[PDB]
Design a protein around this ligand. Structure first.
Ligand SMILES: [Mg+2]
Ligand SMILES: [Zn+2]
Length: 197
């Protein structure tokens, strides 16, 4: 408990989680399977804020599937992610918090694995077309928020846009609201802390 080389990261995450208001809508999305997640985002539109972090997968062979066909995150761009950050964020979430999601199955599993059966999920149950209404607009306006999706998406016309946990949250909220947010949410976790020097 005393002397950790990751004391800073821990304090940063604690400070970020303390900013979450359990009275407001909070979105959560992950990329990667719930057993080996590689990207996590929480987004609270009412406070114009988000928590966003990464982790290196433990199953590198399995990671290839999501990388090529879903999220487009290359191993090179997350191999230096500080381990445990993603789990620490989940561990700190307030008791019994209501979390908004699109497609609850994998998130439920993720949270259950983390022993967070107390967290409650709303699934907005969008169709794919509904969920991604604002995809191009979100990448145009907010794409600079995540530069970690550099792999071309293969179809197992034109390549699909890769899925980013953060931009997914933003575009899902935009779909629910009918419009993109006023302007630019603010990161609660400084990017430089998500990765090894
Ligand atoms: Mg997603
Ligand atoms: Zn991303």
């Amino acid at each position: 408990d005393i002397g950790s080389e990751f004391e800073g990261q821990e304090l940063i995450v604690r400070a970020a989680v303390s900013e979450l208001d359990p009275s407001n809508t909070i979105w959560l999305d992950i990329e990667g399977p719930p057993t080996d997640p590689v990207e996590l985002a929480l987004y609270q539109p009412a406070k114009k804020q988000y928590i966003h972090c990464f982790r290196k997968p433990h199953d590198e062979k399995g990671f290839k599937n999501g990388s090529r066909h879903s999220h487009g995150i290359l191993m090179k761009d997350i191999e230096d992610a500080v381990p445990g950050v993603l789990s620490y964020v989940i561990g700190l979430l307030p008791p019994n918090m209501v979390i908004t999601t699109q497609g609850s199955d994998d998130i439920r599993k993720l949270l259950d694995i983390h022993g967070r059966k107390d967290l409650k999920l709303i699934d907005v149950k969008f169709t794919s077309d509904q969920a991604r209404q604002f995809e191009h607009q979100v990448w145009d306006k907010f794409g600079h928020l995540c530069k970690q999706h550099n792999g071309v998406i293969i179809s197992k016309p034109s390549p699909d846009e890769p899925h980013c946990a953060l931009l997914d949250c933003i575009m899902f909220h935009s779909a629910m609201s009918g419009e993109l947010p006023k302007e630019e949410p603010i990161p609660l976790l400084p990017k430089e802390f998500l990765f090894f020097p």
